[PDB]
Amino acid sequence: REDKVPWFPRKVSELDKCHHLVTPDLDLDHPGFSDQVYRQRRKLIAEIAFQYKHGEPIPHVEYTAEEIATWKEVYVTLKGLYATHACREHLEGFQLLERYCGYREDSIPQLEDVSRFLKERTGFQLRPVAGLLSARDYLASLAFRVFQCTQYIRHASSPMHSPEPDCCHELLGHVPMLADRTFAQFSQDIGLASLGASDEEIEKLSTVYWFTVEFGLCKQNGELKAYGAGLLSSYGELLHSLSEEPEVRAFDPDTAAVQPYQDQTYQPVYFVSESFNDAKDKLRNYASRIQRPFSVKFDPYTLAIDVLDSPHTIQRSLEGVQDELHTLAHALSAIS
Amino acid sequence: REDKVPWFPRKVSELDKCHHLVTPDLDLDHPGFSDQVYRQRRKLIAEIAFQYKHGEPIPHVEYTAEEIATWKEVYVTLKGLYATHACREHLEGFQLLERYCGYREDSIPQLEDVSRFLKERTGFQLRPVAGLLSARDYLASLAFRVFQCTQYIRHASSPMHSPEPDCCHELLGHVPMLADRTFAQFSQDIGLASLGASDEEIEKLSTVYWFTVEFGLCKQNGELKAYGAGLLSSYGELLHSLSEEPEVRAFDPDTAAVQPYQDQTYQPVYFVSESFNDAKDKLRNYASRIQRPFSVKFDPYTLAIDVLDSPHTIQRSLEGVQDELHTLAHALSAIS
Amino acid sequence: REDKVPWFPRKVSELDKCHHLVTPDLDLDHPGFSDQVYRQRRKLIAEIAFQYKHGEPIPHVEYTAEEIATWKEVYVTLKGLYATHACREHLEGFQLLERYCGYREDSIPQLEDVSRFLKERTGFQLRPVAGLLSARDYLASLAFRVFQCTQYIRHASSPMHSPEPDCCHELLGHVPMLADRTFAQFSQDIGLASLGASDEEIEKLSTVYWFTVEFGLCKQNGELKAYGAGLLSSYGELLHSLSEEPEVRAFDPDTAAVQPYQDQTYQPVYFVSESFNDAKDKLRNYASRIQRPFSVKFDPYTLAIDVLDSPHTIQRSLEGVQDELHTLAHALSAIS
Amino acid sequence: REDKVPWFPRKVSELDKCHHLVTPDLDLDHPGFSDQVYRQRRKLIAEIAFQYKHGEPIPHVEYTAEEIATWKEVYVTLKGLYATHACREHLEGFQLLERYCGYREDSIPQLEDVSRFLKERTGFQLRPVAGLLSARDYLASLAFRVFQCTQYIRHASSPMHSPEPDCCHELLGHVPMLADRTFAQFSQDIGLASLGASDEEIEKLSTVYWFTVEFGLCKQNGELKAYGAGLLSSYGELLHSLSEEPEVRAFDPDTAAVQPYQDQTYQPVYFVSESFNDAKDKLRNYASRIQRPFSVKFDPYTLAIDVLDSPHTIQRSLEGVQDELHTLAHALSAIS
Numbered sequence A, B, C, D: 001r002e003d004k005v006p007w008f009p010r011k012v013s014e015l016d017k018c019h020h021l022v023t024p025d026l027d028l029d030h031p032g033f034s035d036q037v038y039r040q041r042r043k044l045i046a047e048i049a050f051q052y053k054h055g056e057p058i059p060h061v062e063y064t065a066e067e068i069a070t071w072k073e074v075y076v077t078l079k080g081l082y083a084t085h086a087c088r089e090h091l092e093g094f095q096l097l098e099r100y101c102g103y104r105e106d107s108i109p110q111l112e113d114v115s116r117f118l119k120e121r122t123g124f125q126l127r128p129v130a131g132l133l134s135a136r137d138y139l140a141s142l143a144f145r146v147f148q149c150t151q152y153i154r155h156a157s158s159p160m161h162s163p164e165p166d167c168c169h170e171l172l173g174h175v176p177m178l179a180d181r182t183f184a185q186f187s188q189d190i191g192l193a194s195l196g197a198s199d200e201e202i203e204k205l206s207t208v209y210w211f212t213v214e215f216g217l218c219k220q221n222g223e224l225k226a227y228g229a230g231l232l233s234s235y236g237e238l239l240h241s242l243s244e245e246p247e248v249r250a251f252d253p254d255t256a257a258v259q260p261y262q263d264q265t266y267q268p269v270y271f272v273s274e275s276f277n278d279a280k281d282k283l284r285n286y287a288s289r290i291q292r293p294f295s296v297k298f299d300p301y302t303l304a305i306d307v308l309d310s311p312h313t314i315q316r317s318l319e320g321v322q323d324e325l326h327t328l329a330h331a332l333s334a335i336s
């Protein structure tokens, strides 16, 4: 998109430039395309995204009673499928969100309280987004453990179906899995691999993401469970994903990277990973075979990207690893 | 101070409880002890500390022209000794503060702009503090790479001498070395080692800190240089520390831990470390011999402290280390 | 077989006690069961095994012209299938054996020259064995990178078929793959995992070995190839293993561990591993789920087994690993 | 000595070429220079060295009663100083040699039984040597954990003083410390660093060796103790090294590398290391600053030297390290 190696952010601060790329207003088919009070609600909300700068608390939004209404429905009815259809990671994270983030049916949660919660749990943070970002910019944000998150609710007339990602989909579909350590790392890895990759590689990556983060399945105690946000936020797709109707293939980064897909109707094919550690390993062997004359490694202390393109930059990181192994050597003597 | 193992913070968020412990108002000897306009200035300022909660931008302070005056003097005259008396780390960091943090003689820098700068450089952040904290609480903050920092200027009548640490001492004496990677880790290590240690161990640790962070010397290209904040912020002590008057001993954590010291007059003894990597190694072998039935390791993604007190918690950290070694294996193939 | 945790060797020297367990003389069906000159040849040969002590050069055997004859046939005719049916590891190793170990059609190679060759190539060594050892003792030897190897040739009347493993099967079927680094480690891992395991676990392990080391298949450039010794030493089984007749399943340690099998007729099922690094990882996750209150790690400097059953023994090994990471840190600066 | 980078052995097998470089027959001053029966004894013995090939058991030597006599004296009288003058490592190793290697006053031990013992204890082995090798060849042998060892006894007329290293000096002065893990690694490190170094670097290295392996002192429980072989095998030097007569300096690889020394009279200067781990670290930082465009790492499975001169060869070693960290991760779960 940019050069031989497209420009990519190296400082979390630079995500402020990877937002300049969106797409607004509704289509004919949309639930409130012909509601002017709602179109006003959206512009007001998007505006919080357009004004947001890395590092500021995320502006609260005062939700109207009907907005809270649309929320109460999406919530209650998905709540009912989770115990049977959701992966253990999602139940664990949804319970913590309830215990410390006021997740409940009569109140929409505020992004800043959720971001705070993710930060202390996995280091992930939210950034308010106006709606659908470029593939490269979205994945680039995942690289800093930053989730581009929508703040506006879907139109109240069709609470059970929402084309575009809304806060219901973000808060009930994505956020909970992001509270799990292994999943959080899997997500960042996808963004880490995307950094400065060709538009084609970005495309393959978006697709791996689609078939995992958005619509992935996993097996636990030999039962099949959803973990994809697009499934955890859709009453109908959730039932169908565990049914006998679609085909389910072993998750393999290369097969998934080229599996085509559409987005209006339910998925006819899904990929099951055996465990997140397993899909994480498979995904890294995959970005490994990615043509690149360097590699990147996240610096969690500075929220920066270190480019490893020489013996020296690799040695510098190695030192950090050697410090850590020292600390573990000491913990072994302390515990006897 | 607390129990068999005194309570210690495990979440950066908990530093909000390790502040409840201070000491205010001036003494007879102090430069503006008998200035009521100044005593008002201080109470107003301290108040920003007392109100501060982890995570909020640090309130700017509008400095009066005379305050900026006291600053212009401390600044200009120490500026003049740095090229000859300061360690390379301090010159490098002071230059970056000037290039990106508006360090200059006619304006006092604001804590929030400095904290932002440290965060992107080494992961350190500032927390406004009302003035002298307990040893345990101060070292406990260093554990999360949080520097408890004073916001008020010293009384304008004696700009060249300041008993208590003031913003001049913090911003010109400490901050610059904190922009260096190895020093930043050395500092956090001292706080990391202090966590849940006996009051006696805290005492030994405070002393190691005194003889290093506050008044340490190091050798570079076979010349002796200051890096201690108490030296980098004191015109007179700086000259004397490199003179033929005091005695300088090799830095050794055990000897320093029990070297007595006073604080009204210049130091008669200082310890020289060979390199910060060397003093860092010496200091970790030292907290290693510290009686403790566990060990701690910082989680930079969550700003938390992981207690390593069992094979399982050690294995969990090891996994993070194994992830990293994987990334480095990949960077080696990418660069051929 | 022994106690709560059966006795296992901890020093390579102790393999001298894990030989006391065999099985001699032929059956009706065997090619020279009714040849008394041959039965004499075997007893003489076995005797070299029965007398062998760890560390002595392996006694040469002067092969008779007919023995060399039986060899010339097995050789030449398998030689003809290797280019098309063998894995790259086997071609590479067979070429090195030819270039430095006098592998040729008119001379049977001597164990001591082969052991010497393996020692400098992968650290593996041969030990002369009288014929079929207990599962535990054979796998226990693999733990020290010691291959229990037969010295006697199969009866000259049926050169194309040999029930028991003979030197043709050992030297042409096993040895070559043992010259490959990854395979050598895979083999030792199986023995490492067997150490002090229950008889049932030994049974599962023998079976994993059967379906890999003895009859495994792998895929390379999307073609299927043999690497199992039982295949590389059998003209007929080799053709059939790559045919459309048997079924080939993905290699999975758990499935293979319980796949039944017979040994008189060709295999109806085989498992394909994707790469030896992949099967090696799969096999270690497998011995990981093995019930054991310790773990073992090989000490290559002393040819001993270190039992890791406490924080301290794990810390001791960690130190060796930390030494190595230091050496690699240095090689990074040296190469710039 | 050889080229831009002098040839160096990469396979233990190649030490057979690093022996072609010696120096025989006695001087006027020597205890039996004018004894023709003894000069015959030596030539016979040297001959075992000249004929020796890597890997063969070392030929036993049948010691004459007077030879055993000279031995009984050197032995008994040094035995008497060890409890008070020797480092703990030497006492521990001398006790093991007595318990398993028949070290006693009335019998000279045979090299092959000692080599066997060292091999199972630290991986070190002995190689019979005819007497004083070139610096590069001797250090090059230490790189493979091979100690070039003399087999002939010193002339019976002066049992208390021996110019050249004899088997008394080798077996009582060196061997015991080589049974200690840390010391064994320190010794190999010196040889590892010598590989392909300039003649000048070899010279500095020989000197570090002199002041450590041959005449080093260490401190234990705040007492000073000998560990240098030249001290552990000399009644007189041993007493003097711990006396108030010579000067003792902190061990520092750079200072020692250029400290001059003579060999006829006792040492006027010695260097004390704090612990072998400490001197080992100091020595590696030292070979680190050694001008070299690669680094070497020992392969214990093959007794070879891996040259790390590219990202790829470093990655290959890293993999071995990553395998090990995996094994330790597993031992942590097994022990809970």
Ligand SMILES: C[C@H](O)[C@H](O)C1=Nc2c(nc(N)[nH]c2=O)NC1
Binding pocket: A129, A131, A132, A133, A134, A135, A138, A148, A149, A150, A165, A170, A206, A209, A210, A214
């Ligand atoms: C939150 C909102 O969906 C966000 O703007 C975007 N999401 C996604 C995206 N692209 C992909 N592939 N997947 C997403 O979830 N583009 C941007």
Ligand SMILES: C[C@H](O)[C@H](O)C1=Nc2c(nc(N)[nH]c2=O)NC1
Binding pocket: B129, B131, B132, B133, B134, B135, B138, B148, B149, B150, B165, B170, B206, B209, B210, B214
């Ligand atoms: C910034 C201000 O000096 C801060 O409150 C404190 N500093 C220090 C302290 N204690 C020690 N030992 N050293 C300090 O620099 N107590 C608290």
Ligand SMILES: C[C@H](O)[C@H](O)C1=Nc2c(nc(N)[nH]c2=O)NC1
Binding pocket: C129, C131, C132, C133, C134, C135, C138, C148, C149, C150, C165, C170, C206, C209, C210, C214
């Ligand atoms: C070399 C000879 O085949 C050797 O005695 C043995 N081989 C094997 C064995 N057991 C198994 N499972 N696999 C072998 O290859 N028992 C002992």
Ligand SMILES: C[C@H](O)[C@H](O)C1=Nc2c(nc(N)[nH]c2=O)NC1
Binding pocket: D129, D131, D132, D133, D134, D135, D138, D148, D149, D150, D165, D170, D206, D209, D210, D214
């Ligand atoms: C064992 C005998 O002393 C051996 O031949 C050699 N020893 C030594 C040597 N060179 C040094 N520097 N140190 C030794 O101990 N040259 C060869």
Ligand SMILES: [Cl-]
Binding pocket: A182, A275, A276, A277, A278
């Ligand atoms: Cl998992």
Ligand SMILES: [Cl-]
Binding pocket: B182, B275, B276, B277, B278
């Ligand atoms: Cl440094």
Ligand SMILES: [Cl-]
Binding pocket: C182, C275, C276, C277, C278
């Ligand atoms: Cl492979």
Ligand SMILES: [Cl-]
Binding pocket: D182, D275, D276, D277, D278
């Ligand atoms: Cl030690």
Ligand SMILES: [Fe+3]
Binding pocket: A165, A169, A174, A214, A229, A230
């Ligand atoms: Fe989504």
Ligand SMILES: [Fe+3]
Binding pocket: B165, B169, B174, B214, B229, B230
């Ligand atoms: Fe200070």
Ligand SMILES: [Fe+3]
Binding pocket: C165, C169, C174, C214, C229, C230
């Ligand atoms: Fe076999």
Ligand SMILES: [Fe+3]
Binding pocket: D165, D169, D174, D214, D229, D230
């Ligand atoms: Fe010597």
